[PDB]
Amino acid sequence: SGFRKMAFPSGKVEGCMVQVTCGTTTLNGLWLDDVVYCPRHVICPNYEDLLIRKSNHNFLVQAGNVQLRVIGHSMQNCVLKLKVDTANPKTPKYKFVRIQPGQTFSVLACYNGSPSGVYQCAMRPNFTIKGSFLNGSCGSVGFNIDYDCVSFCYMHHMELPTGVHAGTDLEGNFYGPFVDRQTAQAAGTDTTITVNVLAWLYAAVINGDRWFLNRFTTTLNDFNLVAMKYNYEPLTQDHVDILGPLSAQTGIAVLDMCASLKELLQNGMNGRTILGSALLEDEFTPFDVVRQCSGVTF
Amino acid sequence: SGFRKMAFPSGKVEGCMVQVTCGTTTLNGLWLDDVVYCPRHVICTSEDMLNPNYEDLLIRKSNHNFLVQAGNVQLRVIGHSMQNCVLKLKVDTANPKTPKYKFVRIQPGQTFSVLACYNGSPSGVYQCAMRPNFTIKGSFLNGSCGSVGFNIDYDCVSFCYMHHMELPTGVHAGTDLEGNFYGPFVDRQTAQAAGTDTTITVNVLAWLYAAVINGDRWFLNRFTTTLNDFNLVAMKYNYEPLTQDHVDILGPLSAQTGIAVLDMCASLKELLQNGMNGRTILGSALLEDEFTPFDVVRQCSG
Numbered sequence: 001s002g003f004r005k006m007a008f009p010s011g012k013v014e015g016c017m018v019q020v021t022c023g024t025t026t027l028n029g030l031w032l033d034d035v036v037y038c039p040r041h042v043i044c045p046n047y048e049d050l051l052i053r054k055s056n057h058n059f060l061v062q063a064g065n066v067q068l069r070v071i072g073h074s075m076q077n078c079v080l081k082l083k084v085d086t087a088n089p090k091t092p093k094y095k096f097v098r099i100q101p102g103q104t105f106s107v108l109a110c111y112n113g114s115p116s117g118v119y120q121c122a123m124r125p126n127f128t129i130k131g132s133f134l135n136g137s138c139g140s141v142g143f144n145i146d147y148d149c150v151s152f153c154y155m156h157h158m159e160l161p162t163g164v165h166a167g168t169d170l171e172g173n174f175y176g177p178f179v180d181r182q183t184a185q186a187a188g189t190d191t192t193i194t195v196n197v198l199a200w201l202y203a204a205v206i207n208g209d210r211w212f213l214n215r216f217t218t219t220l221n222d223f224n225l226v227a228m229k230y231n232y233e234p235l236t237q238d239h240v241d242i243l244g245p246l247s248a249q250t251g252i253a254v255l256d257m258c259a260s261l262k263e264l265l266q267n268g269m270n271g272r273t274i275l276g277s278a279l280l281e282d283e284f285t286p287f288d289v290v291r292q293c294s295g296v297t298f
Numbered sequence: 299s300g301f302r303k304m305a306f307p308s309g310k311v312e313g314c315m316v317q318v319t320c321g322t323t324t325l326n327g328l329w330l331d332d333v334v335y336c337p338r339h340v341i342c343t344s345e346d347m348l349n350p351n352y353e354d355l356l357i358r359k360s361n362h363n364f365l366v367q368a369g370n371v372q373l374r375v376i377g378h379s380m381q382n383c384v385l386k387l388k389v390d391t392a393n394p395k396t397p398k399y400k401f402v403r404i405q406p407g408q409t410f411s412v413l414a415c416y417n418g419s420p421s422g423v424y425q426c427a428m429r430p431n432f433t434i435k436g437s438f439l440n441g442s443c444g445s446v447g448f449n450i451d452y453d454c455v456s457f458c459y460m461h462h463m464e465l466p467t468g469v470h471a472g473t474d475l476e477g478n479f480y481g482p483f484v485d486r487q488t489a490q491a492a493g494t495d496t497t498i499t500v501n502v503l504a505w506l507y508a509a510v511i512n513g514d515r516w517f518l519n520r521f522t523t524t525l526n527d528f529n530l531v532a533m534k535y536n537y538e539p540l541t542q543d544h545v546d547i548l549g550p551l552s553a554q555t556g557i558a559v560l561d562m563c564a565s566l567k568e569l570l571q572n573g574m575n576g577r578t579i580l581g582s583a584l585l586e587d588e589f590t591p592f593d594v595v596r597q598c599s600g
């Protein structure tokens with residue numbers, strides 16, 4: 001029993017964190033095989049003009065108490081790739097994956113190439129992450145683990161004026177309409193990840209929290225008319241299919257659980273909580289719920 | 299900016315997780331130097347958990363009865379001893395991944411990271427607190443026994459908890475790494491119940507200062523309070539008494555924000571009275587009590 005916001009074990013990623021310094025800027029890098037990946041703003045904007053003026057020895061790369069020698073450099077979108085002479089012996093099995101809004105991942109927050117904390121978070125529908133970052137956290141990475149393969153999905157680049165964060169995938173493509181430049185940027189209006197709230201309601205049922213259940217059902221269209229009114233993302237037939245296993249395990253049809261969600265949105269919780277929370281949690285996917293309520297290991 | 303429930307990076311602990319099997323029971327062990335630490339109930343069977351005599355069950359065991367697996371490698375057990383509710387298996391190989399470590403016993407209200415494991419394999423990491431009733435609100439399934447709680451100060455891992463059991467309310471009970479249980483619990487399946495739980499007041503105050511540091515002041519008021527009047531009010535909402543030690547511990551956060559501890563206490567009294575009125579504090583509609591004053595300073599400053 002119990003339901004916590006759980007992150008993946010960070011060990012395979014800790015063995016890849018390095019410190020990258022260029023001039024007066026110090027941030028974090030990801031050392032995989034013989035390449036160090038980091039935000040291109042470390043050179044700071046005409047990046048392939050600021051970069052032309054740089055030589056290999058301008059980039060100081062530190063892996064623990066060891067200096068790595070930079071033997072090459074190239075830019076891919078908003079990521080700088082520093083070719084180093086030494087392949088990382090702790091390089092895990094890995095892939096670079098681009099995630100969709102609503103998908104969750106673990107973040108290993110780092111300062112000076114040293115990991116300080118690990119937390120779980122979700123890519124918001126407005127493409128920002130509600131992270132916990134300070135100056136020097138740039139280059140910190142987001143990831144998932146499947147069996148023994150680390151899927152790198154995020155690299156931190158900046159904080160927006162509302163305190164939320166913006167970054168890229170590991171190929172340097174930003175999530176959202178953001179640019180790596182000090183300019184007037186703002187996160188768009190955010191919405192609640194409906195499929196994730198439903199998954200968390202199934203996790204509550206599995207944990208013996210059933211007060212919100214009711215005898216009612218609803219249509220997908222009727223539910224989306226209500227959900228669009230409460231700034232909730234539309235629920236697609238794909239989400240309904242993804243929730244199938246949890247529906248079969250608990251005996252509560254997905255549209256049966258949607259009628260619970262509609263009543264919670266129109267009437268509130270009335271002094272009651274669900275899994276120790278007075279708000280509807282949207283940062284657990286259906287897969288996160290199945291993984292935690294079955295104990296999958298890595 | 300931002301305030302998350304943050305766990306310590308688990309890598310230094312992952313490299314210590316092993317699988318311990320004795321008979322038909324399989325659970326997790328912590329391999330540090332040439333010793334594997336695990337719950338002593340790994341020697342118990344079906345009609346054993348009500349009233350086990352661990353000294354009697356252990357005297358019948360030989361070193362080769364304990365199967366220890368580190369990854370795809372079998373470790374050879376060359377000795378065994380019991381220290382309180384922990385079994386210590388001496389092995390023939392020192393763990394080359396042994397980090398710098400200490401065994402520390404924590405007090406209620408202290409937080410720590412848990413690396414949840416099954417079959418010596420880590421599955422997840424989460425942050426939690428030792429409740430005032432000495433239980434932890436963890437996320438554990440059957441086979442997670444032997445999973446550990448820890449903190450990391452610079453490069454030293456402080457092991458503070460080992461998981462042993464789930465109580466009937468879904469909460470968890472365990473020991474420190476010397477096998478002394480936290481709370482009035484025993485490693486027996488006899489009828490046991492967690493005492494009435496309370497809110498960790500010093501932690502709620504620390505989290506209110508974290509909200510001020512991140513720019514939120516909506517909950518402050520022009521009032522102050524005496525420590526005694528605050529405690530008379532706090533007890534009525536099932537909050538732990540706030541001691542002078544707690545007031546001294548909050549000193550740095552009070553100095554940083556310019557809000558005296560007893561002024562913040564007056565604001566907490568008002569929140570308890572009014573509720574949040576559709577608002578949140580740091581993305582939460584409930585008062586958070588699983589961040590210590592030390593966690594707040596670490597996450598907001600470094």
Ligand SMILES: COC(=O)NC[C@@]1(C(=O)Nc2cncc3ccccc23)CCOc2ccc(Cl)cc21
Pocket residue numbers: 001323339340342343347438439440441442443462463464465470484485486487488
């Ligand atoms: C050989 O005996 C065991 O292995 N006993 C484990 C056991 C226990 O609580 N295991 C579990 C621990 N944590 C989460 C759990 C989630 C669901 C189910 C079991 C869980 C079994 C039940 O009663 C006792 C009594 C005392 C003690 Cl110290 C341990 C236990």
Ligand SMILES: [Cl-]
Pocket residue numbers: 403404405408
């Ligand atoms: Cl302590």
